[PDB]
Ligand SMILES: C=CCN1CCC[C@@H]1CNC(=O)c1cc(S(N)(=O)=O)cc(OC)c1OC
């Protein structure tokens with residue numbers, strides 16, 4: 281009876297195995313754009329993905345994940361609210377059954393069709409496991425997806441999903457450039473939060489870009505053909521793999537922009 285996104289194992293159940301689900305620093309949140317304050321103390325954000333080394337793509341039964349060689353400083357995030365150097369380790373998505381839902385963060389209660397999470401760890405903690413336990417150990421760059429025009433930089437991901445339909449399947453995914461998933465603007469909101477999946481560690485600095493990327497209906501339809509189930513189990517389409525907004529509690533969301 282392990283965690284998932286169903287009626288019987290979904291986000292309303294996770295607190296029983298992971299009591300921090302009802303904590304003071306949970307993610308995602310609704311971003312109230314009126315409440316969020318411009319922060320002039322935020323340093324320039326640096327998304328340095330030129331030397332990224334993608335390795336594999338994996339269906340983990342929750343999402344699909346692209347992992348990166350993070351054995352040295354290749355693709356890194358620094359600046360903005362961050363101190364020091366955070367290495368890209370993986371990206372994955374969250375998406376819906378319909379184009380009006382799928383994102384984890386919301387913006388003035390607006391849900392997007394999907395959300396991309398680029399997961400990074402603080403190199404002062406030497407590895408991602410040790411980082412994942414420190415209050416400033418992880419940084420996740422969140423990008424909303426809306427349905428409209430195709431995103432050419434996403435198509436190499438969409439075209440391999442056929443090969444990883446079921447939980448436990450992986451494929452080679454070398455020479456993928458995550459710069460092709462970024463919008464033009466790096467305007468962002470930031471707040472202290474958590475992983476949005478078990479174990480829900482309160483160890484994430486969230487950086488959520490204001491500008492969504494457009495993807496086509498054909499691209500998001502391909503996400504919805506994935507399966508939560510393993511090969512030769514009953515088919516359960518991998519859709520609505522998002523946690524809803526959690527209480528903001530005593531936190532401030534800071535904007536990088538006026
Ligand atoms: C080695 C453990 C820590 N690394 C770095 C932080 C997240 C990652 C561990 N967990 C994940 O890979 C993982 C993380 C997230 S999330 N939205 O970043 O919390 C989502 C997921 O699948 C919807 C994941 O797989 C279940």
Ligand SMILES: [Zn+2]
Nearest residue numbers: 372374397476
């Ligand atoms: Zn995520």
